[PDB]
Paper text:
AtzC is a member of amidohydrolase protein superfamily and is the third enzyme of the atrazine mineralization pathway.
The malonate (a poor inhibitor of AtzC) adopts a planar conformation in the structure and packs against Trp309 (less than 3.5 Å away) as well as interacting with Lys65, Gln160, His219 and Asn304 (2.8–2.9 Å, ~3.2 Å, 2.6–2.7 Å and 2.5 to 3.0 Å, respectively). Oxygen atoms from both carboxylates of malonate are within hydrogen bonding distance of the water bound to zinc (2.4 to 2.8 Å) for both instances in the asymmetric unit. The bound water is also within 2.7 Å of His249 and Asp303 as well as close to the bound malonate moiety. Although a malonate bound AtzC structure was obtained, the structure of AtzC with its substrate or product was elusive, despite concerted efforts.
Numbering used by the authors:
A (entry chain A): 3 to 403
B (entry chain B): 2 to 403
The structure:
Amino acid sequence: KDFDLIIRNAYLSEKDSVYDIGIVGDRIIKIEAKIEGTVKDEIDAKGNLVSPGFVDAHTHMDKSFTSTGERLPKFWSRPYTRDAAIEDGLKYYKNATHEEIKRHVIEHAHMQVLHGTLYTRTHVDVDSVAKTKAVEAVLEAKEELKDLIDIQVVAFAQSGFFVDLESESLIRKSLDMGCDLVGGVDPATRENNVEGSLDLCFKLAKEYDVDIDYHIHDIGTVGVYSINRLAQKTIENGYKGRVTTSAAWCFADAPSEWLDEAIPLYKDSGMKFVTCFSSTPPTMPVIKLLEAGINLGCASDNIRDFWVPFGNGDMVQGALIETQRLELKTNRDLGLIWKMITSEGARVLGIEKNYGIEVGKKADLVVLNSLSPQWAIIDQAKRLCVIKNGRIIVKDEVIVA
Amino acid sequence: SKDFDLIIRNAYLSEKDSVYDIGIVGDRIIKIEAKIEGTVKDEIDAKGNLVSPGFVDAHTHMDKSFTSTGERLPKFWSRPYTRDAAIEDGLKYYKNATHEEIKRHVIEHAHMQVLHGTLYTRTHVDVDSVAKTKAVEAVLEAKEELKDLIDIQVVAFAQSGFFVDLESESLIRKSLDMGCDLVGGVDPATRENNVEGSLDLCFKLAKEYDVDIDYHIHDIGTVGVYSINRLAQKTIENGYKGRVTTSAAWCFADAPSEWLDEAIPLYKDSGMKFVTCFSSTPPTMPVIKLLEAGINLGCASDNIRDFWVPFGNGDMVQGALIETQRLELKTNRDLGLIWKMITSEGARVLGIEKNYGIEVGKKADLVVLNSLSPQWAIIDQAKRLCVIKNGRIIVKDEVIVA
Ligand SMILES: [Cl-]
Ligand SMILES: [Cl-]
Ligand SMILES: [Zn+2]
Ligand SMILES: [Zn+2]
């Protein structure tokens, strides 16, 4: 047979036209207006958009779905604060079992792939109560999920290196077990030590030769200062391109000149950013960052836990949410959000060379039931088909792997 | 003696916080009991999930909906939104639009709404020197054909402005004579350039036909609040307490909070009602604060897939999620207030509250959801299982079966 799989009549946004896509093994081999040749399996996209797999660049798979089980979501009789949610986590992880955490990770991943997400980066709580229990469960589930979704795992010091003093050794072990990145939280308002927390993070990252993903939620000028120190140390440590800042809410309320001043530093350091659609501030300068050529991905953040009650693991839904948070309507702007859930995310994850609907790239694709990125955001139609490693894994809302 | 025309089994009801069977005869709820003895022909098992009254989309523009559709990309959206440019696109559209095209759009809009469990809506219809009464005629006609699916109130809406399009006054009078249910205008300040005159004219017309009022006030900041204050004061002077709605009211987001604090007693004294549309609700809109003060605040789609708003699925449960995200809400209490906005607050805006709710004696207009509670429905966005209007099943598993 000439192709293992052909997708017929696929509208491709980057080319602005309709094409047949021919696939062999896990690779795209041919993209032509009409493909002749024999073929084992076919999918007709019927003139609708086919897209690369969506990238959910920031999740917490380990503690997901912990709000579920009752008539009302658990934990949400009281308002959100970072420190209270940290406490709920310590209480939860005290009695949580390896199998419960694993089941949550798998459930999370299944929900993501049903919505066309084929790549994700998850953080995992590492602290003196969870120890490496969560890491173990996540790494194990990651192995079992290889044929559905690619997962990068961040060893994440949720309590703070200088607040939970067991964090440093537990993170080292976590990275020794095979976590892919390392990260901390709020060098200023959580750690009370910007220089020390950041320096420690880089030391650990260099010991295991891993990339960095840091949670910086601190608002205003203290947030921007924290990210500036991060970016400066990124350069000093020879880590250009290897560092991600997650959240960065501070760009919304810090004076705009602080961001204007910092952009060249972020470009020089190759700083990457992820904004999560469960918290992106309505005045976040998302479009401005993209127009400046800053690499900005998008993400679910927490799903149905003591941090965020919401979540469907659906990046197309997240795109709609972002348009509404940021008050966007033009085709251009909706197109930039679509980039955020696709090619920007790929770039954050470091997989851009293998990402996209181009000959030679990975056959990880989503056939949608809408005509274009803009219409898919607007109409929220369910995914028709999902393809991973050139194999069909989702058809009409069902996992068929 | 006679037996139920319809029973819904195992219905979780939010106001009672328990699971009940619901028995229906004709268009009315007759019995709500833990177990209704005996079987009937037409039954629906809710399987322990939430059953809710029909959702209220308290503000739509059915007449010009879906005009953005037809191509690979949405039409009209190569340029950013401004009120005045969208007014121009409308005048251009209505020049060549046919009675049948407008009607088809209205029906398509309504079908999309009922598929998502909306059983009551208030739509505005452009009345101006280009549309004339063509849109009104089409909407009133479609409204008659849709009675078994959805209740529609129709606002004769002077979109161009009474003092900008001078043919508006006479066209509105005929529109109301044809049977529109309410009258309204737009932006007394920045569109009409005449706050006293536009408002006084609107009340004169409203009194001539004994209809209620729904005014679009999109003007931001203190000019918006001033406009609404004048509206509320004239509401009292004209003996129209309870008969006036202010749509949008974006100005409450950016006007100083002490302006809203000062105005609240006036709004209560006038019985002013408000609608915020989830396609534009400003992120700092004091939604919770208005509700906690006992102000009546409903929710709505606004435009769907046109030259004003490209978005829209006519789905109030989706709108609820959008509002939680716009306003940064997470607590069960706050999500519960948003659910009130898409149900009982909307009913109150529309004036149907005496017949609205899952209570014995009320209208059997209901939605069976695939989620456990208002909060979980907002979060998980599951499709509607069943929709019931006038005690008859009209939607089953994403299909209109009426
Ligand atoms: Cl410091
Ligand atoms: Cl005036
Ligand atoms: Zn996070
Ligand atoms: Zn409107």
